[PDB]
Amino acid sequence: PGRVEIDDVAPVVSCGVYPAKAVVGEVVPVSAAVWREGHEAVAATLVVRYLGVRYPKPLLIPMTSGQEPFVFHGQFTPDRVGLWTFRVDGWGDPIHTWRHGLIAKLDAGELSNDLLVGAVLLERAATGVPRGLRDPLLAAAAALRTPGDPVTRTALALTPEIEELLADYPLRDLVTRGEQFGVWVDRPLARFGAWYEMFPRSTGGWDDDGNPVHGTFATAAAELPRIAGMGFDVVYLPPIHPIGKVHRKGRNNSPTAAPTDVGSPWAIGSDEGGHDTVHPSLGTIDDFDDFVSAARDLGMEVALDLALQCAPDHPWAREHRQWFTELPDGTIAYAENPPKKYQDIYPLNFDNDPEGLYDEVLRVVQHWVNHGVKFFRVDNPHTKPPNFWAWLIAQVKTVDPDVLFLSEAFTPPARQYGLAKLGFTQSYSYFTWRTTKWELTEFGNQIAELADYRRPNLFVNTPDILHAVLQHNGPGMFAIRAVLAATMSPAWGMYCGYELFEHRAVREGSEEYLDSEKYELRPRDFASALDQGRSLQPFITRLNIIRRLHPAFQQLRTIHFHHVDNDALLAYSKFDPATGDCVLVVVTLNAFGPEEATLWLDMAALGMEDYDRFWVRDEITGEEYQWGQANYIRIDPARAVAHIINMPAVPYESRNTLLR
Amino acid sequence: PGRVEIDDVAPVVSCGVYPAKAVVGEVVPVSAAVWREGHEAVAATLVVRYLGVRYPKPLLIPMTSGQEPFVFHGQFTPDRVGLWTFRVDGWGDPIHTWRHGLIAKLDAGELSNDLLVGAVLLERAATGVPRGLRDPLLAAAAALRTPGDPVTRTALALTPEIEELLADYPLRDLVTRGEQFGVWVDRPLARFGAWYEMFPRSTGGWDDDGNPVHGTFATAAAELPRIAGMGFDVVYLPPIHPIGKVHRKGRNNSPTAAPTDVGSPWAIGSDEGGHDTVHPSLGTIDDFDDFVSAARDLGMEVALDLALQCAPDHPWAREHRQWFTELPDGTIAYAENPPKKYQDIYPLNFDNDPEGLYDEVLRVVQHWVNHGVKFFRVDNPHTKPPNFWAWLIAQVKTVDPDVLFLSEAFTPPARQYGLAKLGFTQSYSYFTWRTTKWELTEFGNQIAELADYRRPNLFVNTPDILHAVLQHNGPGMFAIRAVLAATMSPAWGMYCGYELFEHRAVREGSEEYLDSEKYELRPRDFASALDQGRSLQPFITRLNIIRRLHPAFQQLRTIHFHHVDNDALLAYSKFDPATGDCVLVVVTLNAFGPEEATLWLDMAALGMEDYDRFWVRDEITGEEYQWGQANYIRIDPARAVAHIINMPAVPYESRNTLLR
Ligand SMILES: OC[C@H]1O[C@H](O[C@H]2[C@H](O)[C@@H](O)[C@@H](O[C@H]3[C@H](O)[C@@H](O)[C@@H](O[C@H]4[C@H](O)[C@@H](O)[C@@H](O[C@H]5[C@H](O)[C@@H](O)[C@@H](O[C@H]6[C@H](O)[C@@H](O)[C@@H](O)O[C@@H]6CO)O[C@@H]5CO)O[C@@H]4CO)O[C@@H]3CO)O[C@@H]2CO)[C@H](O)[C@@H](O)[C@@H]1O
Ligand SMILES: OC[C@H]1O[C@H](O[C@H]2[C@H](O)[C@@H](O)[C@@H](O[C@H]3[C@H](O)[C@@H](O)[C@@H](O[C@H]4[C@H](O)[C@@H](O)[C@@H](O[C@H]5[C@H](O)[C@@H](O)[C@@H](O[C@H]6[C@H](O)[C@@H](O)[C@@H](O)O[C@@H]6CO)O[C@@H]5CO)O[C@@H]4CO)O[C@@H]3CO)O[C@@H]2CO)[C@H](O)[C@@H](O)[C@@H]1O
Ligand SMILES: OC[C@H]1O[C@H](O[C@H]2[C@H](O)[C@@H](O)[C@@H](O)O[C@@H]2CO)[C@H](O)[C@@H](O)[C@@H]1O
Ligand SMILES: OC[C@H]1O[C@H](O[C@H]2[C@H](O)[C@@H](O)[C@@H](O)O[C@@H]2CO)[C@H](O)[C@@H](O)[C@@H]1O
């Protein structure tokens, strides 16, 4: 009735309600506590199996004891997409009990009894191994028959052919089965990729006069190489749907729209079309299909903004009206967040006609899926029912499992981290409003930590957020945030124009871009900026190449912070369990002054003893240096705001430093 | 479905496999995280119901939001022994949504629409309240259907008359019910009581010559008043069973036993009897019944050592030999811990004849339960199968639920704390080997929050443990540990002779009492020590009185440590959620020197603002003083090694100072 106890198993999420998250080729660490009566030794074997794909022959991996007694650790690396299962099985290994006990008493060294007990072990042990190589067992099983010196037949106890033999085929006693938990593996882009947010309309390129010109998918596609050139793996496009014509918004959040103004893309829908139609000015849907294929040619993928909202002109406003929250006087209520108003849209109502709306939205998501779009940016997901997301998310991947979702949830923790739990492959974070060494240090450790179920996407900016620190610290700071986002997380992102050092907010104390891109056409000339040397495009490229270069940067779990005695300096390191690759990042939070300090290292964390000395190389500088536990470091902006340092590869003791 | 989200419920143990622990009249704090779509407000109601006894119509308590968004906290206080159940139910309260939304918009200040929506709510709400006082809502509902002032029907919202009944009877929408978890409540002695350990035989009192004399229950009962006099609630007796005559141990763990020597009581069993018989030299079983009844007259309870072990001459050795571990040569193995030998006892074998041993031991426990013994100190339980204890425990408590078990498990955490999870009402701890300011600090804080499954019993000493710090720091230290034990835990204990300052170890570097009572008979003359002023009995008495006096000391959860800028000084405070009682303890760890420092307080923890100044009284000294956030303290041993301070009672905001 449960003789051997198994508890505090990890990774488990919400006590097993939600599966943990991992990706292909990621080392997944498993741990559990196994114990039994007295001083009889115990061991556990971790059993992993890969099932179907769904969502709502065993493989055996041996587990190893560790620092803390009775807690056993293991790892496994999943090789195909779908839903995996693991469980921990616990058993008592008498051989270990017998062996360890015997070595202590042999020291006292007659006693003839314990030896025979061993002798009956290997025989019973032997039945488990096939007659073929079982023959050193009978050597051991016929090892303490006859009287003699102690080192008589222990001689077979100690040689590593039968320790190795017992390893492949073990003597298992009192086997007890553990609980089963599940892991959901996604394609690697779920963890490691870089984002670019661009407006297709802004690819217009001016007219014969000064006036901005509306772009098209065709014009948009011309800018795709340059993006790929910077190393981004995913291109994110704001909604490509028709914009409502009533209450269309003007320049600067103005209530009244000029006849030519475009209005914000998130005001989805018009007499012209719904969520399933391309806004005609961009082109026919074939042009889009053509646009996707261009990106695909460059190694990139396309992600569309998915905003479950409607403009008044949206066909649903006419076709299906049960889907909204209707006021008492027959008017239809504008989407609302008190007392501020976003007048150009309608909130959906998920309670009046649930299976009605559910099936239609699924149809729509499926539409774009059929057109090569396999990454969606769910918009303001926290203002829609959770169970819906749990359903919609689970529903799409089961027919096709390579579709991934990103949650734009700027919301308090319980909701933000909560949403991740229900299936979102990625989530936005509070990253932008973390700017002090202490916010960032705890934040870095925080990310993650939550890796078993949350993978964060760190965005340096979004059309709605230009943090104050970018406003007054000048072009230097833009580098700093880029270094932080790119290094802290495998997944990071950027909004267009960031590369131009766009740092002007509409008015002081606001976080909205002046002459915001949501309401106006803004073609930009990146090439000229490059020529006059006022673009951060080369640097970002160098940042993006480096992450791809070092697989250490694709890890969530292994971030570790090292001590630097300067409030303005931040130093942390990441490593890869697989290749042993190891990297240390040192950045300044001060854009303005040269800063110097003494850097102290936790050598154990890098896999070396404290007195060691080793050589490092700076991937930006190319400089090589000799280092030890304590090293001198000085950072000078207007030369380089950060040092990305390559460190000696962590020995094949990588696996235990990943533990927990 | 679940339409509304419920997560991170606490207190839950091992994801619900094991019930949490609590006792009667203890405030049990419950917390959970509840959230839903958008800015619509949400609330939760905690539903508690009391089930039967067993082990392996509703009452409703409203839950309140707090500092951290979306996490709701609640409490309930169980009033009868048995198994309780609780679950969290989640719902959306539209009024709150409507109310909070309207107040923000009212400042903008026509609005003609929102008011009717409220008005259709309050009416929909009226359906929930029972014919009679239902009506001012309809009054509130029809006071703006009429056009008018904005402030006109806010009138009917404004009034504290309308926050009302709705708290008592609420309008609940989209109600979703949470998972169910269980709590097992024991009698209060499970948490709060003090222990005294005595050898019945040591109550012998010499003969006409100098020679010590073996005692009896009769003689043992003579020492019971003085024990009660010191305030102890439980008397713990080493096994009272017959001691084996074969391989019986001599003075000082000597291998050979003299003819008169008594042997260790844990060497259970002889030709005279087994576990079901009283050792005859102590008396007839009636004498025991008389002794137990005697203690109960004094307000005490009797606790017997439950040691699953056998001497060679034990009846089981012949009667049932399947129950033992028989060697290959037919001998049966002596108790063993490699390479140490415990020649006087036999380990049991729980695998050969499981239902065989299970059934005898349960019978044995029931024998003594029938004789008024409802507390057992299970001996070295970690050297017996886990599942067994889980079985034995659930089996005993269902017939009689007032039987409680204490686990002497000096074992690594996973096992020690693990064992507590299975049902052990109390557990021994690592307390004796914590002697530095940081260790005691960590240990005290550590007590919590494991309160949900572990209640620690802090023993200053046992026959097996005479700590080094006691060895050289003189009688002063003995006070210090007593203060630490009594204050840190609601439940604490003492082994006989401690009060006489017995401080001599067998050899330097050992933790065993010289001329140990386990192997030798040791009568003591407590009275003479009193006259000659070398007894810590008065002080201990004052300590136990103080504990009973302040109910704050019966709490596990609320211990909090305050900063004192001295490495030799330790200051912590406890309070009682019920009466608001609050107490602060300051103790010194150096027995030899006067020590002084500046004591800093976190007033918020004590329920006061930082600037407040207030009056306190020292329960040992008796005089009143005035204090503030920072106060001067100096401690002089050889007058008093600690200050136990009565502090201003925590206001009726105790409950919120308890969250999580
Ligand atoms: O060439 C690179 C550089 O060029 C441009 O800067 C030029 C600039 O136009 C010119 O006027 C001049 O500027 C002065 C500057 O006005 C002075 O204020 C002086 O800055 C010092 C400053 O007054 C100090 O307060 C000091 O504060 C530091 C902190 O010590 C740091 O901790 C850090 O604060 C961070 C903080 O730790 C966090 O907790 C969080 O709050 O976030 C903060 C990040 O801002 O940084 C602040 C401010 O840096 O720092 C300075 C001294 O250490 O410096 C100039 C006097 O020479 O200098 C430039 C001409 O060479 C362009 O604006 C820059 O973007 C570009 O990087
Ligand atoms: O009369 C009442 C009094 O009588 C007895 O004590 C007398 C004692 O027999 C007598 O010898 C004398 O004591 C002397 C002592 O011999 C000297 O050694 C000296 O003691 C100082 C000591 O050398 C210092 O190292 C200093 O150490 C403190 C630490 O500062 C504390 O941090 C603390 O250490 C704890 C530590 O923090 C933890 O990490 C952990 O390791 O546990 C430690 C606790 O053991 O305690 C030690 C010492 O307690 O403390 C002394 C500085 O004054 O000077 C002494 C006299 O100046 O004095 C006594 C009477 O004459 C009887 O044993 C006492 O119980 C009784 O109160
Ligand atoms: O849809 C028009 C509206 O867009 C923005 O408002 C939302 C929108 O859902 C997303 O862009 C997302 O970022 O959140 C925004 C704020 O909740 C604009 O902020 C707003 O000016 C515009 O009317
Ligand atoms: O049980 C008697 C036997 O062991 C003793 O030690 C005991 C101790 O008394 C108990 O607390 C029990 O739980 O386990 C201990 C074993 O380490 C004596 O130390 C020993 O001499 C005696 O033979």
Author numbering:
A (entry chain B), B (entry chain A): 15 to 70, 92 to 144, 149 to 699
What did the article's authors report about this structure?
To further characterize the maltosyl acceptor binding site and the mode of GlgE binding to linear polysaccharides, we soaked Mtb GlgE-MAL co-crystals with maltohexaose immediately prior to performing X-ray diffraction experiments. A crystal structure of a ternary complex with Mtb GlgE bound to maltose and maltohexaose (GlgE-M6) was solved to 4.0 Å resolution. Initial inspection of the Fo-Fc maps calculated following rigid body refinement revealed a horseshoe-shaped density that was more than six times above background. This density, when fit with the maltohexaose ligand, corresponded to a single molecule of maltohexaose. The maltohexaose binds to multiple loop regions of Domains A and C that define a portion of the acceptor site; specifically, maltohexaose binds the short loop regions that connect secondary structural elements encompassing residues 465–481, 504–514, and 622–632. Specifically, residue N629 in Domain A forms a hydrogen bond through the carbonyl of the carboxamide moiety, while the side chain of F631 forms van der Waals interactions with the fourth sugar of the maltohexaose. Surprisingly, the maltohexaose is situated approximately 26 Å from the M1P binding site; a distance that requires approximately three additional maltohexaose units to span. However, given the modest resolution of the maltohexaose structure, the orientation of the maltohexaose cannot be unambiguously defined until a higher resolution structure is determined.
GlgE is an α-maltose-1-phosphate:(1 → 4)-α-D-glucan-4-α-D-maltosyltransferase that catalyzes the addition of maltose to maltooligosaccharides. Deletion of the glgE gene in M. tb results in the rapid killing of the bacterium due to the toxic effects of M1P accumulation.
